[PDB]
């Protein structure tokens, strides 16, 4: 689990 947004 990291940042779940689209980067």
């Amino acid at each position: 689990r990291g940042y779940p947004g689209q980067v």
Partner: antibody
Amino acid sequence: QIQLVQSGPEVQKPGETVRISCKASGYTFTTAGMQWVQKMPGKSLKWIGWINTRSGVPKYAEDFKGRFAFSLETSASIAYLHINNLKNEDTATYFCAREGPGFVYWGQGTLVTVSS
Amino acid sequence: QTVVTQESALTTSPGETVTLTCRSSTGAVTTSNYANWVQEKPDHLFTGLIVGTNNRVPGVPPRFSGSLIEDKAALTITGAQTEDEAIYFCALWYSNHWVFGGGTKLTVLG
């Protein structure tokens, strides 16, 4: 040079709908998510949510998911914010901001005014 | 509750160093809060400065740098310039939502 350019100010009556556009340039539109932010004078910035520009899947803040929806027009590099069944307290400036993580490149803001 | 606090206002002078901080109500800020620093200038001109705690946005001057210090996130401006007079916001990610701090009004003297 990355730019996000939003549509102009809108004034509506309660119960109506508004659509705000956010036109992106200077990068490949579908490689980073687009976030939306609500701001009112002397109140905190509030995160509305994001949309994944590759998959089209949005993620909403709890207080906004009832009436706010995000969409895309991929072929025009446009993200849209749709505010439904407007309330007088939706009166605010709305910003698009590109990921990320978080809020990297910002549109200039769009003032939505809702009458009494 | 997820509340992000910043200093209300700070004053610096040209060429000096100033540190802005961002505190979390839930405990120590970590990498997992993806601290973001954003600058607001007049007429709603917002510019992202730092993402992911310490990653400077391309084209942002290298005098801005992000870190974790003393359970907080920190924006250090090493060699402040007059043009850095602005409101600085920090945003933190709390598992499933972003929260903005209240902003720090930075004044640059002279």
